[PDB]
Each structure stands twice: as C-alpha cells, then as structure tokens.
Amino acid sequence: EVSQDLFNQFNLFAQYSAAAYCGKNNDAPAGTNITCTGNACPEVEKADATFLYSFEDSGVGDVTGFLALDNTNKLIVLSFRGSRSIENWIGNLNFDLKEINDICSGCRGHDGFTSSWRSVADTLRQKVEDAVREHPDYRVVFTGHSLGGALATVAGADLRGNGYDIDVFSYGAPRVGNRAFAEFLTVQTGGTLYRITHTNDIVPRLPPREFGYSHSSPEYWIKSGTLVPVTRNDIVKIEGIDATGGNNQPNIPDIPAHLWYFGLIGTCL
Amino acid sequence: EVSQDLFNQFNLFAQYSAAAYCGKNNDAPAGTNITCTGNACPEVEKADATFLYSFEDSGVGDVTGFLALDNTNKLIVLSFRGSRSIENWIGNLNFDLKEINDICSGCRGHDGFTSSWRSVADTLRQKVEDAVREHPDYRVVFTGHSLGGALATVAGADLRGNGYDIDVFSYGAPRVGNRAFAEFLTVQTGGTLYRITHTNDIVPRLPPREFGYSHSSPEYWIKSGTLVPVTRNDIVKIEGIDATGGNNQPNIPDIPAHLWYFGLIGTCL
Ligand SMILES: *[C@@H]1O[C@H](CO)[C@@H](O)[C@H](O)[C@H]1NC(C)=O
Ligand SMILES: *[C@@H]1O[C@H](CO)[C@@H](O)[C@H](O)[C@H]1NC(C)=O
Ligand SMILES: O=Cc1ccc([N+](=O)[O-])cc1
C-alpha cells in the first residue's frame, strides 16, 4: 500500500513524537544527543540528532516539546508532546471553536489548541527560522502525537508559506477545527500533512463532528492491532474530508489503540 | 534456540500472567470468560477459558491473581499478579532470608514471598485440588510475572508431590532463596519450572547473589529487545545454577526491560 520510503518516514516521526514524552530531556542543553527510555525512539538515536531548543509548560497552554536538528536525515524537527494524562485530558476536553482568520479566512479552530499555539508561536517561529537559516537545505518537519499532533497541525497551517516547506506528521490527532479549516489543511501548498491514525483510536474521533468539527484529507490509517507490529500492507490511504472507513467508523473507540503507533507512544515504559 | 512447542507455551503463559494485571475483574463471577484490556492476552481470549476463582489482596502478603480453566488447551492455571507498582516494589524490596525446612532442607527462602505464599497456601491448594479432581487429565500450571513469578515458583515448590504434576512458568521472577533452594528448584520431581527472563531485566537480578541468593537452573533468556517481538530463535537456554551469560551479566540493568515478555506485561495500556 504505502511505499517503504514513506513507511520509514511514518516510523521515524512516530518516534520523534514518542520522544517528546520519553526523552530523557529538557533542562538538557542544546547540542545534547537525543535519547529515550524504554527503546521508545531507536531510529532517532541512530541519527546524529540533537536538541536545538527544549520547552516545558510554555505560555498559556503549558506547551511541551523540542526542536531538533538531524544531520543524518537532514531535518529540522519540531516535536510537540501530547498530554501527561491522556485519559483526564480527554475527560476535560472542551469543544469550543474560536475564530482564526489569521490562519485562513472563514476558519475556526478548537479554542485552546489555537490559543496554546498562538501563545508560543513567536518564540517557536523564531527558533525554527533560526534553524532554517543555519541549514537552508534541511527539510522542516513538525510532528506530534495526540494533543501534540494537534499543536503540530496548527503550528503548521500557521507557519506555512513563509518560504520554506513545512511537513506535518500527526499521530492520533484530534480534529482541530471547522469544515473551513479542514479544507485549507487538505489543499494548502508549501508542505504536506500526513495525518496518521490507528484502528479505533478514541482521540481522532474528538471533538465530534456534531460540535462543528471536520477532518482534513487524506488519512493514513493503520489497521494492525494494538501491540502488533506494522507493515506497509496494513497502512491504508483514505481520501475525502470527513471520510469514513478508516478511524472514523461507527464502533466503540479505545484508549489503548491511541497508544500504539508503530510502537509505544503517549507513554513510557 | 528453543523449540516451537516451548515457544508457544512460553507465549501462552506470558499472556495468562499478563491477564493477572489487565483482566477486567477480581470480583468477576466464577465461570465468566477471561478477557483483557489492550490486547494483553489474545491467546487466552482465543481459548475456551473461564475463571474458577478470583482472589485480591488475599492474606498477609496481599496476594492477587486467579485460577482458570482452559478447555481448549486442557489446563488448570493459577496466575499470580505482580505488584501494582513495580518501581516502588523494586525500591522497597526486602532482602531477608528465612528458614524453609518444610520444603527444602538447609534451604532458605525470601521472607516476604515465602510468608505471602504460606498465608494463602491452604485456600489455594484446596481450589487447585478441586479442579484436578474434576479434570483429572488437565495439566496444572502455576504462572506469574515479577512478584507473581516468585510466588508461583514458591507455590509450585510447595504443592508438588501430591500426585499431580505442577508446571511453573515464571516471567522476570526475582531470586527466591538460597543456594540450597536453587538446587532444590533445579532437581525437584513432579513438574518443570520454566524460568524466563528478558535481556537485562533488573528483577531477575534481585535480590543480589551478595545477599545469599541463588538462581535455579536452567534459565530461558529472551535476547530480543524491549518492544520487539519474540521468536523461538530469540530464546537461549542457559545451563547452571547462577549461570552468567544470560540475564546474569555484570552490565547494567533496566526497569523497562522488565515490562516486555513476548508482549506488554506488568502494566496495561
Ligand atoms: C552523540 O552522537 C554522536 C554521533 O551521532 C557521537 O559521535 C557522540 O559520541 C555522541 N555523544 C555522546 C555523549 O554520546
Ligand atoms: C465465552 O466463550 C465461549 C467459547 O470460548 C463462547 O461460546 C461464549 O459466547 C462466551 N461468553 C460470552 C459472554 O461471551
Ligand atoms: O523440535 C523440537 C520439538 C520439541 C517439542 C515438541 N513437542 O512437544 O511436540 C516437538 C518438537
């Protein structure tokens, strides 16, 4: 189904995403090697990959994440950590939209994601711009799992078309806003969004459609089970704004499927 | 490096051992199907397997687990759960030996596992005997992970010789007593103890040899990594009491390598 190369990328960015939780990081100076506990990110550890900038509980939304430089793969990576307790995070999830014409006209995003981002966008934009200047050749990639996925997607849409492409790899992301925003996410030039999902993950199903939310297309849907290893065959590309038949299907969703994207994520052994 | 047949058994009882933590109910009526959250025990779910008796915090050691009937595999399974928080347990783990002449002569066992078993021995042995009666041709198997493994090893050594074989499958079990016990564990008749360890898992390294502890022979050492799938080619039988070159290496250990036996164990997604 998907290519080996695109598979390799899916796997690697699943890992930089997992590293935002299990990175033995932060309070860790720039230029330290990136390493995780619990074999959470061995492909990152194999790369000559290092922190550029770490943040923990930044701005209103208490954002957490790292900016990384990878000389092996030629990347600059912005990885957003999802929540420390996904369960309570999902419990307390608020479904309010807020306006964001700044990102695109007619667009409304989950208020809280957009707000948390907005609050750190100036620091982070500057940090990325600095790294793009130092390595104009390197590919810029934003990524995150869960809440992390959300922030990476928002930051993406916000920061694109300033000259450098920004690719986004998201794993188990919630919906981030209205149908207008979803449309912009599906066409927007200057980088690709790879929206990855697994089986019946609960997180991609929130906020629900009924509250005025849509998903971008396409969807990269993993169909091998929780704790099962992923092969190229399982991954199914799915087209259509709010298309069904991937993660968006009418059955009971699952918290454990949220924590298995290529390997363990959202939690550290 | 092990047989397929033995691989399959190791895998099945890793899952019964996982079910002791992830199976939804320690007040679930006898007779109900055995199931787990988070795909922790799909070979179990796949068998006609039911609860016979569920215990929780039982006796002085606060021992938890279940006894099951498996009509597909023709087994009677006693599964001991390890500690609800392994890092703490591992931290507040006492190293004192006690006399246990009742089982082994000149053999000293760990005080807490020994007393914990001893305090629930009578009820549990009654419940196994009842199942052995009703299903005389079923294999009796005691199994456990972590503390769970210590307990199954202790219970096995204690209840053998009553006319039914008891096989023991332990996962990441600590050392359970002194050199005499190790020997008594190596040779005892009336069943087989299958002592499975993983890479540089820390628990099988405790308590230390330097507190008078010895390990029974042999050892089934899983060499494949944390979050990596196990095949029969990844298990090596190591011969000798206190053999080195399996888990018993002078390298440094790891807590995570204690939560991955064939699959996720000792924690539930
Ligand atoms: C960081 O990794 C580089 C290459 O990826 C390696 O040469 C260097 O030894 C590492 N630094 C440390 C402290 O391990
Ligand atoms: C229990 O499993 C048996 C066979 O393994 C099955 O026939 C029966 O439907 C199950 N009971 C429930 C409540 O699922
Ligand atoms: O080939 C090794 C082997 C071991 C055990 C079994 N068996 O138990 O059936 C068969 C083969």
Query: What does the alpha-carbon distance between residue B112 and residue B151 come to, in Å, rounded to a whole number?
Result: 10
Nearest-10 Cα torsion for A34, A37, A38, A44: 0
Query: What does the alpha-carbon distance between residue B54 and residue B127 come to, in Å, rounded to a whole number?
Result: 11
Name the experimental technique. Answer: X-ray
Q: Are B67 and B52 in contact (CB under 8 A)?
A: yes
What contacts B88, CB < 8 A, 6 or more positions away? none
Name the β-bridge partners of B177.
Answer: B109, B214
Total residue length of chain A: 269
Which one of A110, A145, A198, A258 is the catalytic residue? A258
Query: What does the alpha-carbon distance between residue B262 and residue A54 come to, in Å, rounded to a whole number?
Result: 35
Phi-psi label, residue A194: left if phi above 0, alpha if psi -120 to 50, beta otherwise: beta
Nearest-10 Cα torsion for A165, A171, A175, A181: 10
- Strand extents, DSSP E, chain A: 49-58, 63-70, 75-80, 97-99, 108-110, 139-145, 166-171, 193-198, 219-222, 236-238, 260-261, 263-264
B137-149 in b/e form (b: 16+ CB < 10 A) is ebbbbbbbbbbbb
Query: What does the alpha-carbon distance between residue B255 and residue B259 come to, in Å, rounded to a whole number?
Result: 8
Query: What does the alpha-carbon distance between residue B171 and residue B21 come to, in Å, rounded to a whole number?
Result: 13
Helix (H/G/I), strand (E/B), else coil: B178: coil
Please give, rounded to a whole number of angstroms, the shortest distance from the CA of A255 to a CA of chain B: 8
Q: Are A265 and A144 in contact (CB under 8 A)?
A: no
What is the Rg, in whole angstroms, of the alpha carbon atoms belonging to chain A? 17
Token pair for A208 = 């629900």
Token pair for B181 = 């016990």
Token pair for A104 = 């695109």
- Residue whose structure tokens are 């021995």: B121
Query: What does the alpha-carbon distance between residue B77 and residue B48 come to, in Å, rounded to a whole number?
Result: 13
- Which ranges constitute the DSSP H helices of A92-241? 113-134, 147-159, 179-187
Flag if B259 and A269 touch (Cβ within 8 Å).
Answer: yes
Tell whether domain A1-269 is in CATH 3.40.50.300: no
Long-range contacts of A66-69 (CB under 8 A, 24+ apart): A66/A19, A66/A20, A66/A23, A66/A25, A66/A26, A66/A34, A67/A124, A67/A127, A67/A128, A67/A131, A68/A16, A68/A34, A69/A131, A69/A135, A69/A138
Amino acid at position A69, single letter: L
**What resolution in angstroms does the PDB record give?**
2.2
- Residue whose structure tokens are 């099962």: A228
| Extents of the domains making up chain A | 1-269
Helix (H/G/I), strand (E/B), else coil: A118: helix
Query: What does the alpha-carbon distance between residue A30 and residue A46 come to, in Å, rounded to a whole number?
Result: 18
Nearest CA to ligand 3 atom 10: B5
Q: By the CB < 8 Å criterion, does A85 face chain B?
A: no
Q: Is the peptide bond before B29 cis (omega within 30 degrees of 0)?
A: no
Q: Are B68 and B52 in contact (CB under 8 A)?
A: yes
Q: Are A175 and A112 in contact (CB under 8 A)?
A: no
Ligand closest to B2 (CA) is 3
First CA to last CA across chain A, in angstroms? Answer: 31
Flag if A256 and B263 touch (Cβ within 8 Å).
Answer: no
For residue A130, the Cα-to-chain-centroid distance in whole angstroms is 21
Query: What does the alpha-carbon distance between residue A79 and residue A141 come to, in Å, rounded to a whole number?
Result: 8
Token pair for B210 = 């330097």
- Residue whose structure tokens are 């230390």: B208
Q: Are B53 and B126 in contact (CB under 8 A)?
A: no
- Residue whose structure tokens are 């993993």: A222
Token pair for B158 = 């204690």
Q: How many angstroms is it from B252 CA to the middle of ligand 1?
A: 20
Query: What does the alpha-carbon distance between residue A87 and residue A99 come to, in Å, rounded to a whole number?
Result: 27
Closest CB to A38 among B39, B226, B269? B226
Q: Are A104 and A160 in contact (CB under 8 A)?
A: no
Q: Give the DSSP letter of residue A29.
A: -
Flag if B226 and A269 touch (Cβ within 8 Å).
Answer: yes
Burial class from Cβ neighbours inside 10 Å (0-12, 13-18, 19+) for residue A123 reads middle
Token pair for B201 = 């898992």
Q: Are A194 and A221 in contact (CB under 8 A)?
A: no
Top residue of A46, A202, A227 to mutate, by most chain B CBs within 10 Å, is A227
Phi-psi label, residue A57: left if phi above 0, alpha if psi -120 to 50, beta otherwise: left
Backbone angles phi, psi at B19, to 5 degrees: -55, -25
Query: What does the alpha-carbon distance between residue A225 and residue A261 come to, in Å, rounded to a whole number?
Result: 10
